[PDB]
Amino acid sequence: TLDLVNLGVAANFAILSKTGITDVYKSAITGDVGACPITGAAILLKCDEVTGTIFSVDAAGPACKITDASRCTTAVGDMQIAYDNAAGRLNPDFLNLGAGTIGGKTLTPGLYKWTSTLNIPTDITISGSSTDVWIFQVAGNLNMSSAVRITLAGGAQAKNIFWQTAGAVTLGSTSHFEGNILSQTGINMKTAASINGRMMAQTAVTLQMNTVTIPQ
């Protein structure tokens, strides 16, 4: 009975930020990337790093960039509506689960809230049907330590997982993440971390040699 978070046009993006995209070469991104209203010069991605289109609001950015202000603007706007929709959900199923550290848990469908920072220091499973939905509401940061893998079980799909964070996200080196990130600030990945998901930041996305794939 938990409704999907509608991403509108932002659904078309693996990475969408408002202040840019930094990168330690070489990353492997599958899906479109965009930044707005910042200049496309703030996208530090090469053409060989993106399987998809790089969208700029202006004439600056990587050589393969497409200038389309109105699409980037709509996407960022839809990302804000999604962020507010996700943050606005009421009547959580869980509050302060694991007291802000959830290593080793198996997370079943529902609306989860943390009034603090959330840490993921060891492997977790997300377990549910192909139609089940998870919304994780985090009033601080979200941290996941090096080499931590999020596993999906029971038919659970990346496209039906949403992480809403009031603070910054940090995914440790070589970690594997599952789901959509709606961050009010930054999403910062470290050396060889991967995500099956979307990085939607109201500030910047920062990468270090990452694999980023849009959910199927």
Residue numbers in the entry: 61 to 276
Lines from the paper:
The FfIBP from Flavobacterium frigoris PS1 exhibits high TH activity and relatively strong recrystallization inhibition activity. The FfIBP structure is composed of parallel β-strands in a helical pattern, which is mainly stabilized by inner hydrophobic interactions and intramolecular hydrogen bonds with long α415. Additionally, the FfIBP has a capping head region that consists of two small turns and β-strands, which contain a disulfide bond. This disulfide bond increases the overall rigidity of the protein and reduces residual movement at the ice-binding site, thereby augmenting TH activity and protein stability.
Based on the CD and MD simulation data, four mutants annotated as FfIBP_CC1 (A101C-A120C), FfIBP_CC2 (S96C-L132C), FfIBP_CC3 (M249C-N270C), and FfIBP_CC4 (G160C-S176C), possibly forming disulfide bonds, were generated. The FfIBP_CC2 is located at the interface between the body domain and the long α-helix (α4). To confirm the disulfide formation, we solved the crystal structures of the FfIBP_CC1, CC2, CC3, and CC4 at 2.0, 2.1, 2.0, and 2.0 Å, respectively. Successful formation of the disulfide bond at the intended location in FfIBP_CC1 and FfIBP_CC4 was confirmed by X-ray crystallography, whereas the rest did not form a disulfide bond. The failure to form a disulfide bond may be due to dihedral angle constraints and the inappropriate distance between the two cysteines. When the RMSD values of alpha carbon mutants were compared with the wildtype, relatively high RMSD values exceeding 0.4 Å were observed around the mutation sites of FfIBP_CC2, FfIBP_CC3, and FfIBP_CC4. In contrast, FfIBP_CC2 exhibited a drastic decrease in the melting temperature by approximately 8.3 °C. The mutation at the Ser96 and Lue132 to cysteines likely distorted the conformation of the residual interactions between the β helical body region and α4, which was vulnerable during thermal melting.
